[PDB]
Copies of this chain bind each other. A is one copy, B any other.
């Protein structure tokens, strides 16, 4: 039974996703969270579909960019596995804290 070595599909995936531009979070699930959070701010709110779509393009962009920063932080610690400390270090320097 044939198997790929750990890390080989991963770099396959990276080659693939850096190529494509499609959003990576499922639409509806992301729509729900937007709605749940907004509700907590204010009730009976409605969302132009392109508002949600703005918010997803925005967030994914933000999260992806953050993963690069995160990934650089890991490599600094002479690792290849990103950890919450790497996210945390990235965000502190960024002035998000």
Could you tell me which A residues sit within 8 Å of B by CB distance?
Answer: 69, 72-73, 76-78, 85-86, 89-90, 92-95
Contacts and interface: CB of A to CB of B under 8 A. Distances in A.
Chain A interface main SS type: helix
B92 A72 contact: yes
Contacts of A92: 69, 72
Given A77-B77, A77-B78, A94-B95, 12 more contacts: A69-B93, A72-B89, A72-B93, A73-B76, A73-B89, A76-B76, A76-B77, A76-B85, A90-B93, A93-B93, A93-B94, A94-B94
A58 to B, nearest CB: 17
Contacts of A73: 76, 89, 93
